[PDB]
Design a protein around this ligand. Structure first.
Ligand code: CHL
Ligand code: CLA
Ligand code: CLA
Ligand code: CLA
Ligand code: CLA
Ligand code: CLA
Ligand code: CLA
Ligand code: CLA
Ligand SMILES: CC1=C(/C=C/C(C)=C/C=C/C(C)=C/C=C/C=C(C)/C=C/C=C(C)/C=C/C2=C(C)CCCC2(C)C)C(C)(C)CCC1
Ligand SMILES: CCCCCCCCCCCCO[C@H]1O[C@H](CO)[C@@H](O[C@H]2O[C@H](CO)[C@@H](O)[C@H](O)[C@H]2O)[C@H](O)[C@H]1O
Ligand SMILES: CCCCCCCCCCCCO[C@H]1O[C@H](CO)[C@@H](O[C@H]2O[C@H](CO)[C@@H](O)[C@H](O)[C@H]2O)[C@H](O)[C@H]1O
Ligand code: SF4
Lengths: 80, 37, 733, 156, 194, 80
């Protein structure tokens, strides 16, 4: 498997579902100076999808993407 | 350079077994019997 | 008034020898100190934790320094099988010439002690090869010790004292500890194995001077970034590899061989590297679960409030438990001790059966010492967990704030819990003792065929499920036609099945009726110890006998001879009783482990299989038979290197017996006796010129229990340690 | 409304924009004065170090900057320890448009120096040497190539 | 009320009379809590609808002659190629997982937000059989009864295959050939002491 | 010094006062019980903590309670 299509595809899929499908569900579930949300990560995205969400759904995509590459690499392996 | 001299045990064993305990007991004894103002 | 102790004005005004004793005993009970505030309490604990850390690293520095300075590590690595590790040198002016000669062993110039801690096998497995390696590690850990000691001082200073809210940020601490303290540390240890330990086991030196120019794998990170992760599993070390040399060595760095290295009879270094890499990923991910300053993750309070069964079977469920746990340091410490206490036992059970360190299995004394060492520590830690659970109920528990939740409902059926624990303990005691006694009588009358020998089929069935073909059950990993056997047949089953079907190691030892009886003895010990500790916790706040017990605190002498008599009614006394049972239980566990390995190591498992079904067999064949070399360490005809253990053996018996004095004879007798001595001193010329500053008194009721238990416990431990080491090393040394 | 490190992002309250080079960048909330001085001193050293590495290579000084360490060194350290102590202590005691340009150039140097270190380990090439390789073959020579050809880099 | 599962008994009070498929069967009183019953009502229909498709798919494959339901995915493990009505499907296992996870998450995510709606109608009822909502009671009873039967049938497929290893149609032919000598009582598995 | 408390369940039977070996307790007028007297603990600096008073109390649960406290020469019962 080519790493670019697999990792890009999985990342694209997980960003889409996080923005169009489960964004509403996550927001409903989601809803001394080192413990306060001092910086509000404001975004111009119409649906409220901000950088923190991008890191989260993007991280899942990368993790799932490498799992596909790792599992496939085993097939045809020697001494393993 | 880390190796201590061959005579170190002859000094440190008496030092930590007789001398330092004697000082510690004497120091502690005076402290625990000291009267507060 | 006396200054000491500064933290208790009530003690400082005590005019008797009580004050010094209680000044020491109450020193670390911060909550009871004069003027203590919640915020100051947390800051004091934080500084103390830095003190513990520096002590631990200094202790590790000392062990590294003395082995490098006085050990034979460099000689040991050339022939670990036939050389005894040296712990440190002896310098004792009380020795006679014969003792100097006797303890001169292992190739050292002068008298030395033989190490039983297994640090040699551990340091050798991780890549240490020369005394210079040990020296540098020693200096590094001393520096780390100093830094932690300084950090403890620093965070006590006015501008570096964390606020109370900082200490109560559960979500943030869990995130960092799971991903950083657990995950990154595990990831970093993987790097050491890949970059240093694995190359060293293949005859290549990798150190700080060249580790940036040596490739851990012939393909450097190319497989990692392209997803071809199987490139790292190719060409593992062969079955003929000689540890520490390049002969028969491979190139893989991440494998799943799943057995033992044939020469060292320990876990593969490439399996231990892949283990920590996978654990690191799991923990790093787990550390992104809880909410912090970034608007994602879980709030722990929200999770707890949600988990309430709809039927009302748990009442209010977990409502209010976030504040209960978060506001109680004793609830937290109870949880920490219970978790670490169980983990310590897991370490003991897994390290003997799946030895991770090279040449650990063949060092019989080290194997025995390590299992016994960690199981006793686990036993003490478990008692503490329940002790602080009982302290929680008194000091911290608030019935109003836990109304109807699971915690308050445990108190609602405490009689049901205690009475069922009582039934289980009675059943196990009656029938386990009964069966042993029946077998002793059958043995005594010369009819061993009439004894009751119940096969442990349930446990043998589990062993068969894991691939042990001895019992013929033949299913799961024991059945060659099962899906479980087939699916893993290319990953780890070949190595695992080879190891589990070899009866010369400790991986799922064969078991029989003798193993059946002793396992029910262990269950008797666990249940009875839990009964005493649980009863102590659940009755800590009150009973029908003492309804207002919570008004008297965790530890107090008694409530007097009234109402029938109330000796040992406090929750503290329940813990005191429980320690005796913990020692008895661990004693049964370790006796079992030791005797079963002694007969395996001697090639005669039949002796255990035939003698362990009755108690005279344990007395005659385990204790009496294996004491012979120990008690001859010195005698009228001379002495040998076991004289120290012979002396310590009796030393242990003496301390043990001295403890019986404090446990059996109680205070009033001694207080009257001391008064006659007070009279005598004042009436004696030339001696009444000297006088005391603290009026002598007998030890207090509570203090006698603790001191007596301490003597009992120390003598218990020392006696067995001497017997364990001397009987094993003398046999195999 | 000053420019912000993220489009349409409200600057944090604890950063009022008074300090030089204040882009309202503090997601972790560490800034909730000493750090401002700390940024300059770390930045100032980075600028001197970055200039030295680039300058030394251009003049042909050898060996590589990371190999420069290899008067005896054992005798230099006591001198440097004593010499630098007085300057730092006196500097600390005094503390106890140009500004914006100083910080921005200082920040660039700090990021630049880390590039030198990571590039050396990953590429074994000095900053000018690495730059020339990229210009000659941009697509061919980049992080993707070097990360996937470490054996060749260390095969010399 | 649909009927009585145990003639002569009394319906539990927590099962309303107008609930489709209400035979008064709740011996463990799982639906005693009204909030729990609401979730169970939705879940039963969903399980029945999937089971009805699953049983039809399992039977259709074996009747048409493309193996049994159990052997359908073996191509993805033996290096084979996917087929459908004998038509080769170019996709491989990894591609199929991607399509299914994305598609089902989108469709199931949409249904979840609806808030436990079990009879959407509208776009899901193009022919408008239940559009009236007056006669829908009879149809809802038919759906739940056929759905319950399908759920029981599918468990019969899994259980029967685990015992004899044959496909449901093959097992039926085996029973018909020798009804008294080929049944659950003669597997040697279901009843150990026979 | 130990802490001795009398609770409003006292019936004024006087048995705790009669049993005290240190003369810590005494009876005072009261109106809350039929006997019109309640136990009192005026001299607690002399209490040794023997709890003979608690042994003598008939009420259930106790009406006189001793909480052992800081130790002095008097409370320890020393004659030296
Ligand atoms: C800003 C301060 C500073 C920095 C970043 C470095 C950085 C470095 N010095 Mg150091 N030095 C620094 C100040 C100084 N160095 C030296 C004297 C040396 C020497 C003599 C050497 C280094 C070397 C090194 C390198 C060690 C790499 C390694 O893992 O070697 C692992 C190997 C060992 C630790 C041995 C590394 C690039 C070494 C080098 O060139 O490595 C390539 C080296 O030989 N430094 C002195 C004089 C006292 C300094 C004074 O400030
Ligand atoms: C001052 C910034 C800077 C510049 C102009 C360059 C320029 C170059 N780098 Mg270098 N590099 C830098 C910083 C920089 N680097 C840093 C900080 C690191 C460590 C992460 C590296 C690590 C690195 C490697 C490993 C390699 C290069 C390489 C290269 C060359 C090809 C470009 C490439 O493939 O980059 C790809 C990789 C990068 C890291 C480029 C990053 C560029 C962006 C603009 C950096 C933005 C940083 C950001 C503001 C930090 C935010 C922090 C956050 C906490 C807020 C080229 C000469 C390649 C080469 O051929 O070297 C000889 C090569 O192999 N660089
Ligand atoms: C697959 C779906 C998807 C994804 C993953 C994103 C992701 C993102 N969008 Mg969004 N966007 C989407 C669909 C999506 N969008 C659609 C369908 C539209 C309508 C045309 C928009 C219109 C839109 C706008 C107008 C903006 C974003 C922005 C952003 C970014 C905000 C991050 C930030 O600054 O946090 C803090 C982020 C990368 C903002 C941004 O800064 O993008 C770079 C922004 O300005 N989006
Ligand atoms: C907690 C760790 C620890 C422990 C339990 C021991 C234990 C022992 N050491 Mg060792 N030692 C340690 C750390 C430790 N050492 C360290 C870190 C150093 C390097 C500074 C030394 C240096 C050292 C020397 C030079 C000698 C011993 C010796 C001894 C023995 C007698 C006690 C003595 O003289 O202590 C002395 C302890 C010190 C000088 C260091 C104490 C450091 C902490 C911070 C206090 C005894 C086996 C003696 C020996 O081998 O007799 C045969 C001996 O001569 N030790
Ligand atoms: C780690 C602690 C430690 C150490 C280092 C020693 C050391 C010694 N013990 Mg032991 N001892 C210890 C603990 C220790 N003991 C404990 C805890 C106990 C109680 C259980 C005992 C009980 C004990 C007994 C009963 C005896 C010893 C004796 C000895 C000596 C044996 C060698 C010999 O033949 O000396 C022969 C004596 C000499 C060569 C004289 C050495 C110098 C003397 C002791 C001091 C001189 C001081 C000087 C005049 C003025 C101060 C000088 C100073 C400032 C430098 C030696 C000095 C024997 C002995 O001789 O004791 C005096 C002896 O009989 N010990
Ligand atoms: C993380 C571990 C941990 C921590 C932080 C604490 C902390 C605390 N415990 Mg807990 N505890 C723990 C583990 C822990 N415990 C364990 C493992 C047990 C089971 C053994 C207990 C059992 C326990 C009890 C039963 C009690 C506490 C109490 C306390 C409090 C006061 C401690 C004190 O003043 O001790 C002072 C300590 C001493 C004076 C020293 C005691 C020494 C013992 C007896 C061993 C002596 C060995 C001997 C010297 C060896 C000689 C060898 C020879 C060869 C020379 C404090 C909050 C007390 C309390 O009031 O809590 C509210 C209390 O009653 N703990
Ligand atoms: C070898 C010594 C010993 C023995 C046998 C026991 C036995 C018992 N202890 Mg005890 N205990 C001991 C030492 C011992 N303890 C010590 C040293 C301490 C520390 C102070 C404690 C502290 C302690 C606590 C705190 C608790 C126990 C409990 C128990 C019971 C555990 C359950 C059990 O075994 O039921 C089966 C019973 C037995 C095995 C007892 C022996 C029964 C014999 C064989 C009957 C023989 C009858 C026969 C006809 C002969 C009669 C002759 C006669 C008429 C002349 C049991 C009665 C727990 C308990 O009560 O649980 C309900 C409990 O809470 N023990
Ligand atoms: C703070 C920054 C810094 C530091 C720590 C160093 C450190 C060093 N420089 Mg460098 N250098 C710097 C900035 C710095 N330089 C700058 C800004 C320039 C101007 C472009 C130079 C130009 C320069 C030259 C021309 C040479 C050094 C050399 C040296 C070495 C000897 C320096 C000495 O004798 O004193 C040493 C590794 C010498 C060297 O590499 O010797 C092997 C050398 O020949 N440096
Ligand atoms: C009193 C109290 C307390 C205390 C407590 C304690 C001390 C406890 C302990 C406890 C314990 C100590 C417990 C334990 C448990 C355990 C468990 C529960 C386990 C489980 C396991 C499992 C489940 C497993 C499984 C498996 C197997 C077996 C094999 C294969 C694999 C697997 C994984 C599957 C506290 C503090 C809370 C407070 C309150 C009060
Ligand atoms: C082989 C078969 C495999 C089957 C795998 C099934 C995986 C299921 C994962 C579900 C993850 C959560 O996803 C699901 O969460 C909620 C239901 O719980 C739904 O969301 C809804 O749930 C709440 C509780 O019922 C409702 O009150 C709200 O309308 C809404 O929040 C989401 O729209 C849905 O996406
Ligand atoms: C919804 C439920 C629908 C049920 C449809 C049942 C259709 C039954 C078709 C015939 C079954 C018997 O036919 C079977 O007998 C043979 C006996 O050797 C089996 O062999 C074959 O699998 C098949 O030919
Ligand atoms: S405890 Fe003893 S001395 Fe004190 S009041 Fe009661 S009876 Fe009197």
């Amino acid at each position: 498997l080519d790493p670019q299509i697999v990792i890009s595809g999985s990342t694209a899929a997980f960003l889409a579902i996080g923005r169009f499908v489960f964004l509403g569900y996550q927001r409903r579930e989601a809803n001394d100076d080192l413990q306060k949300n001092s910086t509000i990560f404001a975004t111009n995205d119409p649906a409220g999808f901000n950088i923190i969400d991008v890191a989260g759904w993007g991280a899942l995509g990368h993790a799932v993407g490498f799992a596909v590459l790792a599992i496939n690499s085993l097939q045809g392996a020697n001494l393993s | 350079p880390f190796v201590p001299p061959s005579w170190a045990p002859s000094v440190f064993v008496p030092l930590t077994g007789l001398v330092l305990p004697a000082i510690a007991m004497a120091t502690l004894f005076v402290y625990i019997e000291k009267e507060a103002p | 008034t006396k200054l000491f102790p500064k933290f208790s004005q009530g003690l400082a005004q005590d005019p008797t020898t009580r004050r010094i004793w209680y000044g020491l005993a109450m020193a670390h009970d911060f909550e009871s100190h004069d003027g203590m505030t919640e915020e100051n309490l947390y800051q004091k604990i934080f500084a103390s934790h830095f003190g513990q850390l520096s002590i631990i690293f200094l202790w590790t520095s000392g062990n590294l320094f003395h082995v490098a300075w006085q050990g034979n590590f460099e000689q040991w690595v050339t022939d670990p099988v036939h050389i005894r590790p040296i712990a440190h040198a002896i310098w004792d002016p009380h020795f006679g010439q014969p003792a100097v000669e006797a303890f001169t062993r292992g190739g050292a110039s002068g008298p030395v002690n033989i190490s039983t801690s297994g640090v040699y096998q551990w340091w050798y497995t991780i890549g240490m090869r020369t005394n210079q390696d040990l020296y540098v590690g020693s200096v590094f850990l001393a520096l780390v010790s100093a830094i932690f000691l300084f950090a403890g001082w620093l965070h006590l200073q006015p501008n570096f004292q964390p606020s109370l809210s900082w200490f109560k940020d559960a979500e943030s601490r869990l995130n960092h500890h799971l991903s950083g303290l657990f995950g990154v540390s595990s990831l970093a240890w993987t790097g050491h194995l890949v970059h240093v330990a694995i190359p060293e086991s293949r005859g290549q030196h990798v150190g700080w001077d060249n580790f940036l120019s040596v490739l851990p794998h012939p393909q450097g990170l190319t497989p990692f970034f392209t997803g071809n992760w199987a490139a790292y599993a190719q060409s593992p070390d062969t079955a003929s590899h000689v540890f520490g040399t390049a002969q028969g060595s491979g190139q893989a760095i991440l494998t799943f061989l799943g057995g033992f290295h044939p020469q060292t009879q320990s876990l593969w270094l490439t399996d231990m590297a892949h283990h920590h890499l996978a654990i690191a990923v799991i923990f790093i991910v787990a550390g992104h679960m809880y909410r912090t300053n970034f608007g994602i993750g879980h709030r722990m309070q929200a999770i707890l409030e949600a988990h309430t069964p709809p039927s009302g079977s748990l009442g209010a469920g977990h409502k209010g438990l976030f504040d209960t746990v978060n506001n109680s340091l004793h609830f937290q410490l109870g949880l920490a001790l219970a978790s670490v206490g169980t983990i310590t036992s897991l370490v003991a059970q897994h390290m003997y059966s799946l030895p991770p360190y090279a040449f650990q299995a063949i060092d019989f004394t080290t194997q025995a010492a390590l299992y016994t060492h960690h199981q006793y520590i686990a036993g003490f830690i478990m008692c503490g967990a329940f002790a602080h659970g009982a302290i929680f109920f008194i000091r911290d528990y608030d019935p109003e704030q836990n109304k109807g939740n699971v915690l308050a409902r445990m108190l609602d059926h405490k009689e049901a819990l205690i009475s069922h624990l009582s039934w289980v303990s009675l059943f196990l005691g009656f029938h386990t003792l009964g069966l042993y006694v029946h077998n002793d009588v059958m043995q005594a009358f010369g009819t061993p065929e009439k004894q009751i020998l119940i096969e442990p089929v349930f446990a043998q069935w589990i062993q068969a499920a894991h691939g042990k073909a001895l019992y013929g059950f033949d299913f799961l990993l024991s059945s060659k036609t099962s899906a479980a056997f087939a699916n893993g047949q290319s990953l780890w089953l070949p190595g695992w099945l080879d190891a589990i079907n070899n009866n010369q190691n400790s991986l799922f030892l064969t078991i029989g009726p003798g193993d059946f009886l002793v396992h029910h003895a262990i269950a008797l010990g666990l249940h009875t110890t839990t009964l005493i500790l649980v009863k102590g916790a659940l009755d800590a706040r009150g009973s029908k006998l003492m309804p207002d017990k919570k008004d008297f605190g965790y530890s107090f002498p008694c409530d007097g001879p009234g109402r029938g008599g109330t000796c040992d009614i406090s929750a503290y006394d329940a813990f005191y009783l429980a320690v005796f049972w913990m020692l008895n239980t661990i004693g049964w566990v370790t006796f079992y482990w030791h005797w079963k390995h002694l007969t395996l190591w001697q090639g005669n498992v039949a002796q255990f299989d035939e003698s362990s079904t009755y108690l005279m067999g344990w007395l005659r064949d385990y204790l009496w038979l294996n004491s012979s070399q120990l008690i001859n360490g010195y005698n009228p005809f001379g002495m040998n290197s076991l004289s120290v253990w012979a002396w310590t053996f009796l030393f242990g018996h003496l301390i043990y017996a001295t403890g019986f004095m404090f446990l059996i004879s109680w205070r009033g007798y001694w207080q009257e006796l001391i008064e006659t001595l007070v009279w005598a001193h004042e009436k004696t010329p030339l001696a009444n010129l000297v006088y005391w500053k603290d009026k002598p008194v007998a030890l207090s009721i509570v203090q006698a229990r603790l001191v007596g238990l301490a003597h009992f416990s120390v003598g218990y431990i020392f006696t067995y340690a001497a017997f364990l080491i001397a009987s094993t090393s003398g046999r195999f040394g | 409304a000053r420019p912000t490190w993220l489009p349409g992002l409200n600057p944090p309250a604890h950063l009022k924009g008074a300090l030089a080079g204040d882009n309202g960048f503090d997601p972790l909330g560490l800034g909730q004065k000493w750090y401002a001085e700390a940024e300059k001193t770390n930045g100032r050293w980075a600028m001197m170090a970055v200039a030295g590495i680039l300058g030394q290579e251009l003049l042909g000084v050898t060996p590589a900057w990371w190999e420069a360490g290899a008067i005896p060194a054992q005798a230099l350290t006591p001198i440097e320890f004593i010499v630098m102590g007085f300057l730092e202590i006196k500097r600390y005691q005094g503390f106890k448009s140009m500004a914006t340009k100083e910080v921005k150039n200082g920040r660039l140097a700090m990021v630049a120096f880390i590039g030198f270190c990571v590039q050396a380990l990953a590429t074994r090439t000095q900053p000018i040497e690495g730059l020339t390789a990229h210009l000659a073959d941009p697509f061919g020579k980049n992080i993707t190539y070097y990360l996937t050809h470490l054996p060749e880099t260390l095969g010399s | 009320k649909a009927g009585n599962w145990l003639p002569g008994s009394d319906a539990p009070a927590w099962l309303p009379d107008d609930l489709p498929g209400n035979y008064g069967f709740d011996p463990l009183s799982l639906g005693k809590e009204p909030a729990s019953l609401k979730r169970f009502t939705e879940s039963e229909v969903i399980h029945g609808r999937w089971a009805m498709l699953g049983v039809a798919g399992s039977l259709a494959v074996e009747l048409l002659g493309y193996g049994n339901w159990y052997d359908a995915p073996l191509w993805a493990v033996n290096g084979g190629k996917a087929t459908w009505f004998g038509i080769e499907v170019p996709f491989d296992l990894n591609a199929l997982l991607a399509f299914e996870f994305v598609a089902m998450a989108a469709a199931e995510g949409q249904r979840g937000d609806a808030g436990g709606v079990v009879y959407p109608g509208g776009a899901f009822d193009p022919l408008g059989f239940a559009k009236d909502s007056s006669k829908s009671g009879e149809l809802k009873l038919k759906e739940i009864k056929n759905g319950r039967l399908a759920m029981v049938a599918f468990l019969g497929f899994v259980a029967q295959h685990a015992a004899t290893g044959k496909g449901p149609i093959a097992a039926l032919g085996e029973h018909l050939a020798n009804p008294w000598g080929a049944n659950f009582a003669t597997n040697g598995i279901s009843v150990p002491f026979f | 010094a130990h802490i001795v408390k009398i609770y409003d369940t006292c019936i004024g039977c006087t048995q705790c006062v009669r049993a005290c070996p240190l003369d810590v307790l005494e009876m005072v007028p009261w109106d809350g019980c039929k006997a019109s007297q309640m136990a009192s603990a005026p001299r607690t600096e002399d209490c040794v903590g023997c709890k003979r008073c608690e042994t003598a109390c008939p009420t259930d649960f106790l009406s006189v309670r001793v909480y052992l406290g800081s130790e002095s020469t008097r409370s320890m019962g020393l004659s030296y």
